[PDB]
């Protein structure tokens, strides 16, 4: 079956990045959308799964999550690969890790483990990998003496701000759990105002390509373990540091297929890991239109360096994913703009593909977590917004610069663009006063071809990942399962911008 839309991101990729192919971006075939038995969608793993549920009494979507995170962990015979933003997993993410591990263990495996976080500068780690793997290796008994455990903290870049942003449950290279749900027991468990999220699970090559991408990370994680004030280290049993773990399960063989669906991986490596991909004859002519709102402090490497494009193949994937769009494009964000500064306020290039898609008559609908959200900077679902206008006003300069007058931007704007603040039921706020909160990094273009990852659309520096995946019938169950009911509640909130209807 024909997929013009990953066609059109690889060349991109392969544009970008070719020596990082197959390690940091792959595209596979042969996946399987990872569902349960007489749950042919359950591959989407919502949480906290209460569409038109106010109450959200019962959190069934994140009981499900942790059931699949638990089951996927019980399941590995030879590696268990996870990556988060600090805290190392804890609450009911660390039970599901310890008794996976438990279940493995019992069934005669002797399982390697890793267990990376990123923590931003300014961030205060209260558990250590030292006393996080003690407390692991106290939970899991008797089982800690087969039980291989690398677990780290890493900064890459404090200047820059990079650290590990991505989140990955890999399990012997084989299954995967992706999306931008953290193992923060605050964010979804231990609290009465959860965050909305999604992930999504799949088995086959395209998890070995995530087992890469983790040994990417890696590699430069063992090495600058000899600076500590880059990464901590702690593992168990004595064990070395194992900066190449997936590669040596994955061995010389190919992956074996598990379904028909074709993926492409991509991720990125922030700063202070590689500086360029320095096989690419990538050569842009960047944006020349600086967003006259704001400067940044920082060297500005959303906008305005090429270097980290070739580093960081995941920004270009979006880009000519939204770009792909022959139709019609449903962007569900946190923010699509950063707080600046530090950051840029927008990636200049997504906001001129939005605004080519816009005059073009493609349908562009974004929604974005409520800007009355406010928490500190690196809470989920968290605004950087204080208006939706914030959005609609660039999306309509970006417009201005594009068609040369205001009428022809304002029929663009006023009759393709969907723009709203999310809702899950008919209720605005949660029982306990606050609003709702939306984490999702999704994008998804004419019913084909959809990313889920860690990667948000508003400027960052992370090391993040995700997958994009072409198929009508799993973007037929994505529009089934989570954009058209995002639609129908959250059109309650929809902005209308200056100057329409
Ligand atoms: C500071 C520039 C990068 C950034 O702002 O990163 C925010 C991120 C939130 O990411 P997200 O939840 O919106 O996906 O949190 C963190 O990485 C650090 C927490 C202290």
């Not at 430069?220 to 540091?241: E, Y």
């Not at 139709?327 to 306020?345: F, G, K, M, W, Y």
Request: charged residues 20%; negative net charge; proline residues 7%.
């Amino acid at each position: 079956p024909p997929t013009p839309h990953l066609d059109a991101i690889e060349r991109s990729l392969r544009d970008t990045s070719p020596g990082l192919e197959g390690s940091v971006w792959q595209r596979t075939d042969g996946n399987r959308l990872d569902a349960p038995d007489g749950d042919p969608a359950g591959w989407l793993l919502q949480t906290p799964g209460c569409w038109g549920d106010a109450g959200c009494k019962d959190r069934a979507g994140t009981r499900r999550l942790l059931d699949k995170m638990t089951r996927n962990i019980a399941d590995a015979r030879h590696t268990v690969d996870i990556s988060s933003l600090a805290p190392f997993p804890n609450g009911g993410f660390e039970d599901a890790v310890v008794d996976g591990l438990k279940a493995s263990v019992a069934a005669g495996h002797s399982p390697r483990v890793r267990i990376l976080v990123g923590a931003a500068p300014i961030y205060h780690l209260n558990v250590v990998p030292s006393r996080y793997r003690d407390e692991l290796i106290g939970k899991l008994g008797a089982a800690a003496g087969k039980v291989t455990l690398n677990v780290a903290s890493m900064t890459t870049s404090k200047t820059s701000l990079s650290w590990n942003h991505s989140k990955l449950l890999v399990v012997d290279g084989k299954t995967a759990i992706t999306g931008g749900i953290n193992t923060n027991k605050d964010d979804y468990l231990d609290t009465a105002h959860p965050v909305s999220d999604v992930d999504m699970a799949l088995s086959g090559p395209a998890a070995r390509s995530a087992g890469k991408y983790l040994d990417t990370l890696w590699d430069w994680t063992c090495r600058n373990a000899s600076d500590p004030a880059k990464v901590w280290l702690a593992t168990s049993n004595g064990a070395s540091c194992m900066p190449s773990m997936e590669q040596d399960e994955a061995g010389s063989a190919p992956a074996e297929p598990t379904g028909d669906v074709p993926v492409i991986a991509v991720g990125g490596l922030g700063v202070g890991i590689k500086e360029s991909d320095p096989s690419s004859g990538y050569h842009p002519d960047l944006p020349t239109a600086p967003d006259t709102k704001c400067t940044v402090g920082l060297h500005d490497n959303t906008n305005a360096d090429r270097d980290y494009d070739t580093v960081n193949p995941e920004e270009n994937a979006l880009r000519s994913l939204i770009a792909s769009a022959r139709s019609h494009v449903e962007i569900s964000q946190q923010d699509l703009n950063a707080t600046c500064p530090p950051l840029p306020r927008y990636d200049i290039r997504t906001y001129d593909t939005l605004a080519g898609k816009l005059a073009a008559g493609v349908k562009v609908r974004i929604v974005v977590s409520d800007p009355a959200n406010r928490g500190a900077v690196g809470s989920g679902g968290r605004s950087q917004i204080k208006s939706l206008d914030e959005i609609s006003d660039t999306l309509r300069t970006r417009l201005v610069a594009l068609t040369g007058d205001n009428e022809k931007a304002s029929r663009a704007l006023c009759g393709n663009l969907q723009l709203a603040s999310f809702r899950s039921s008919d209720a605005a706020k949660w029982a306990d006063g606050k609003p709702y909160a939306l984490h999702h990094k999704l994008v998804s273009v004419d019913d084909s071809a959809f990313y889920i990852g860690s990667k948000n659309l508003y400027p960052a520096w992370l090391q993040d990942f995700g997958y994009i995946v072409e198929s009508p019938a799993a973007a037929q169950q994505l529009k089934t399962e989570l954009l058209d009911p995002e639609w129908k509640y959250s059109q309650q909130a929809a902005a209308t911008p200056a100057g329409c209807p």
